Amino acid sequence: PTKLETFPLDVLVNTAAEDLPRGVDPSRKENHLSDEDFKAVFGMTRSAFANLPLWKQQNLKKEKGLF
Template sequence: MLLDAWRVVFVWVGAQSRREERELAERTALEYLATDPAGRGADTPVVRVRQAGEPPTFTGFFGAWDDALWESEPDWEAVRRSVATDNRGVRQVLAASSAQPLPTYPLAALNVREPDRLPADVDPAVKERHLAPEEFQQVFGMTPEAFGALPAWKRQQLKKQVGLF
């Protein structure tokens, strides 16, 4: 996971992550900074933080940080269930699948770096959502649902490969 704290970008690494995932996460953080529209880059530090060894400079960004969380909740699914239980007053009002469909555009119309050159109703952060399902399949080699199930870092990498980041 990446946490952009403006003056520093943290790469949080889970205890069960593989070496290639850790290296890829760090490269993704560097690419993220290199493509930052605000112009940050080489002088912004990227700090790797390991699970269960988070410093106060990292945990301070999370008001309800619990150092013992992973002792009582051994995996992500258990954490997800716990968060849902602890936040019973919060519920999703409109499921993404029931929302109005977004207008679609060809890849060429979305494959621009300057946000002001995009169609007015396109969010530059999620350009891929404006591809027609058939073109999405052709561009990414998978369905939008399969793409959405990928980790965020992997989706970002794929978007960069096709010029949608």
């Protein structure tokens, strides 16, 4: 119950919510990328993602295909 799994950016990034696997959100897609997935697609970890502005954050998610 609750908690998401850990898939790569291919199962997720490709189309809309219909593309992501079970237990995946279209808004917070970076959270479903494993430690390497979030570090490969965004090129940064969650500790750095928290210190982001907002203009870069959105351009970071819109970069691969989330925002």
